[PDB]
Design an enzyme around this catalytic site. Structure first.
Site, PDB file in Angstrom:
ATOM      1  N   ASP A   1       0.831  -1.197   0.000  1.00 45.21           N
ATOM      2  CA  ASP A   1       0.000   0.000   0.000  1.00 45.21           C
ATOM      3  C   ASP A   1       0.873   1.258   0.000  1.00 45.21           C
ATOM      4  O   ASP A   1       1.348   1.673   1.054  1.00 45.21           O
ATOM      5  CB  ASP A   1      -0.883  -0.021   1.254  1.00 45.21           C
TER       6      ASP A   1
ATOM      7  N   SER B   1      -0.096  15.456 -12.291  1.00 47.11           N
ATOM      8  CA  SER B   1      -0.330  15.054 -13.676  1.00 47.11           C
ATOM      9  C   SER B   1      -0.534  16.286 -14.545  1.00 47.11           C
ATOM     10  O   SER B   1      -1.072  17.290 -14.099  1.00 47.11           O
ATOM     11  CB  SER B   1      -1.545  14.131 -13.763  1.00 47.11           C
TER      12      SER B   1
HETATM   13  C1  1VS Z   1     -10.544   4.273  -0.454  1.00 48.83           C
HETATM   14  C2  1VS Z   1      -9.139   3.912  -0.005  1.00 48.83           C
HETATM   15  N1  1VS Z   1      -8.284   5.077   0.029  1.00 48.83           N
HETATM   16  C3  1VS Z   1      -8.346   5.936   1.105  1.00 48.83           C
HETATM   17  O1  1VS Z   1      -9.073   5.758   2.085  1.00 48.83           O
HETATM   18  C4  1VS Z   1      -7.456   7.095   1.031  1.00 48.83           C
HETATM   19  C5  1VS Z   1      -7.883   8.463   1.200  1.00 48.83           C
HETATM   20  C6  1VS Z   1      -9.244   8.942   1.432  1.00 48.83           C
HETATM   21  C7  1VS Z   1      -9.511   9.976   2.336  1.00 48.83           C
HETATM   22  C8  1VS Z   1     -10.832  10.405   2.522  1.00 48.83           C
HETATM   23  C9  1VS Z   1     -11.876   9.817   1.808  1.00 48.83           C
HETATM   24  C10 1VS Z   1     -11.629   8.794   0.899  1.00 48.83           C
HETATM   25  C11 1VS Z   1     -10.310   8.371   0.716  1.00 48.83           C
HETATM   26  C12 1VS Z   1      -6.820   9.345   1.080  1.00 48.83           C
HETATM   27  S1  1VS Z   1      -5.320   8.565   0.795  1.00 48.83           S
HETATM   28  C13 1VS Z   1      -6.101   7.032   0.796  1.00 48.83           C
HETATM   29  N2  1VS Z   1      -5.343   5.901   0.586  1.00 48.83           N
HETATM   30  C14 1VS Z   1      -5.289   4.901   1.519  1.00 48.83           C
HETATM   31  O2  1VS Z   1      -5.793   4.950   2.631  1.00 48.83           O
HETATM   32  C15 1VS Z   1      -4.483   3.680   1.126  1.00 48.83           C
HETATM   33  N3  1VS Z   1      -4.779   2.590   2.068  1.00 48.83           N
HETATM   34  C16 1VS Z   1      -6.027   1.873   1.794  1.00 48.83           C
HETATM   35  C17 1VS Z   1      -6.240   0.825   2.893  1.00 48.83           C
HETATM   36  C18 1VS Z   1      -7.581   0.134   2.838  1.00 48.83           C
HETATM   37  C19 1VS Z   1      -8.801   0.645   3.277  1.00 48.83           C
HETATM   38  N4  1VS Z   1      -9.774  -0.295   3.038  1.00 48.83           N
HETATM   39  C20 1VS Z   1      -9.223  -1.417   2.466  1.00 48.83           C
HETATM   40  C21 1VS Z   1      -9.833  -2.606   2.077  1.00 48.83           C
HETATM   41  C22 1VS Z   1      -9.013  -3.576   1.515  1.00 48.83           C
HETATM   42  C23 1VS Z   1      -7.646  -3.400   1.338  1.00 48.83           C
HETATM   43  C24 1VS Z   1      -7.052  -2.204   1.751  1.00 48.83           C
HETATM   44  C25 1VS Z   1      -7.852  -1.186   2.323  1.00 48.83           C
END
Ligand code: 1VS
Length: 330
Positions: free
Chosen positions: A35, A199
């Site tokens: 990740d 980008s």
């Molecule tokens: C929708 C997933 N991404 C995020 O929530 C996210 C956000 C984010 C912040 C606010 C609202 C929506 C998204 C910012 S950076 C970011 N990136 C991460 O957080 C990367 N990690 C994802 C971990 C994760 C969350 N739910 C899962 C279910 C399966 C496998 C991995 C996961």
């Protein structure tokens, strides 16, 4: 040193990718979701609330002769999708595809939320964003990459995600046979702890390229491509019958549609995401309404170049003293 491991989609939609990781002595192999959008290496474990484990492989620190409890350390993380997990911390030996780090912080889950319990295929996460996001308290811990970096032949790792197919994570070297053309490098800001870049614009199908700055993060841990509402509306306007559905939670489209490609700019270079990469299948079993792979980032607060985008490219995460990102077609 170097390491190389195969990463495999967890299902037929490429909802996430898992990569085998060896933890402890003797090795306990868990399949972790690498990740680049977070910085905690956390695992299902013998400490995880039993009702919250449903098929995952667990790490049992008591069976590892190299595990040491990190005294007083705890962790707790919440992601933007609303998922979360928390627990205590061990240090142990962690290896990925031949690359070994001793004393790696392994965050053992006592609690996980429903999305994690329901994904029997994901045994934990391995964070590859910047260590400043790590949640361990009262002493923040380093990522696997941070720990390995000085030992690597070159301080880099690469993501080569497959569409409906296995791919590869490499540490410490660039496989020049894995991409076509040249790698275009672009500046990164680490201010928010992410691999954040800008980008240079986009195109929809065979349409004209729109030059416009789109700041966002290269995030292997997010499934979809989340972009500004203007860009997303321009994409879906080209798909007859596509609509944003508040009830479903985003753009949906008729499953009978043929989706146009989406191109994004990296400097003067262009990465083309084929239309079928943007199809995430029926919204519910048997439905003829399909979920789109490009969705609005409005209300996220940042744009996210998730797997839909990254899997169209060979991506270099360059952890030199001034980090950069590289993208190549493949
Ligand atoms: C929708 C997933 N991404 C995020 O929530 C996210 C956000 C984010 C912040 C606010 C609202 C929506 C998204 C910012 S950076 C970011 N990136 C991460 O957080 C990367 N990690 C994802 C971990 C994760 C969350 N739910 C899962 C279910 C399966 C496998 C991995 C996961």
């Amino acid at each position: 040193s170097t390491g190389s491991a195969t990463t495999t989609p967890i299902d037929s939609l490429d909802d996430a990718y898992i990569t085998p990781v060896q933890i402890g002595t003797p090795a306990q192999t868990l399949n972790l979701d690498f990740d680049t959008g977070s910085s905690d290496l956390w695992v299902f474990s013998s400490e995880t609330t039993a009702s919250e484990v449903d098929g995952q492989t667990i790490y049992t620190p008591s069976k590892s002769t190299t595990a040491k409890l990190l005294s007083g350390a705890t962790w707790s993380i919440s992601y933007g999708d609303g998922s979360s997990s928390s627990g205590d911390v061990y240090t142990d030996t962690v290896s990925v595809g031949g690359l070994t780090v001793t004393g790696q912080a392994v965050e053992s889950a006592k609690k996980v939320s429903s999305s994690f319990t329901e994904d029997s295929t994901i045994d934990g996460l391995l964070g590859l964003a910047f260590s400043t996001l790590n949640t361990v308290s009262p002493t923040q811990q380093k990522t696997f990459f941070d720990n390995a970096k000085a030992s690597l032949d070159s301080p880099v790792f690469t993501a080569d995600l497959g569409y409906h197919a296995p791919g590869t994570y490499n540490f410490g070297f660039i496989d020049t046979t894995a991409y076509t053309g040249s790698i275009t490098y672009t500046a990164v800001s680490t201010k928010q702890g992410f691999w954040e870049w800008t980008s240079t614009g986009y195109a929809v199908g065979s349409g004209t390229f729109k030059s416009t700055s789109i700041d966002g993060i290269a995030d292997t841990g997010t499934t979809l491509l989340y972009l500004p509402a203007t860009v997303v509306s321009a994409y879906w306007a080209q798909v007859s019958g596509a609509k944003s559905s508040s009830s479903v939670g985003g753009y949906v489209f008729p499953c009978s549609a043929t989706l146009p490609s989406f191109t994004f700019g990296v400097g003067s270079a262009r990465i083309v995401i084929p239309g079928d990469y943007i199809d995430f299948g029926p919204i519910s079993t048997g439905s003829s309404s399909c979920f789109g792979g490009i969705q609005s980032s409005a209300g996220i607060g940042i744009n996210i170049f998730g797997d839909v985008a990254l899997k169209a490219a060979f991506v270099v995460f360059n952890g030199a003293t001034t980090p950069t990102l590289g993208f190549a077609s493949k």
